[PDB]
């Protein structure tokens, strides 16, 4: 009944989220963020970063029905960016590019979300998230 209409609305967001995540992942610049960080080159990511994230993990989380709101999905694109700034020093040019792309990834994601997605449509998602986190 109601739970019906609900999942039709979620399925729709969940579809959009795949398309944003495909767009960010094709982008040349965001390539370093499309894999999980390796611990071969980086022998200390996990001692420095307590919550790793990447774009392919986001992909799967979409299919795992983890993102109830666009805001939830941005919570994880946001964690991509803060992870980079928290890990990489910004003196070396090499270090700096990554830093740049992380801010850019974040800004790109938000602008897309800000521009393609109907404000009325978020409100519906959030009203569904608060419902499912109850009864």
């Amino acid at each position: 009944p109601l739970e019906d209409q609900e999942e039709n609305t979620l399925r729709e967001l969940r579809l959009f989220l795949r398309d944003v995540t495909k767009r960010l992942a094709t982008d040349k610049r965001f390539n370093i963020f499309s894999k999980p960080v390796d611990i071969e080159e980086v022998s200390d990511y996990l001692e420095v970063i307590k919550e790793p994230m990447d774009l392919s993990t986001v992909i799967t989380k979409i299919d795992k029905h983890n993102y109830l709101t666009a805001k939830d999905f941005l919570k994880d694109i946001d964690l991509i960016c803060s992870n980079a700034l928290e890990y990489n020093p910004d003196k070396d040019p090499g270090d700096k590019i990554i830093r740049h792309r992380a801010c850019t990834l974040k800004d790109t994601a938000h602008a897309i979300i800000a521009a393609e997605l109907d404000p009325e449509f978020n409100k519906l998602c959030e009203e569904i998230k608060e419902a499912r986190i109850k009864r």
Binding site: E41, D44, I49, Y87, N88, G94, I98
Partner: peptide, 7 residues
Amino acid sequence: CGRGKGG
């Protein structure tokens, strides 16, 4: 800060 990616 971490050691860096490239070294």
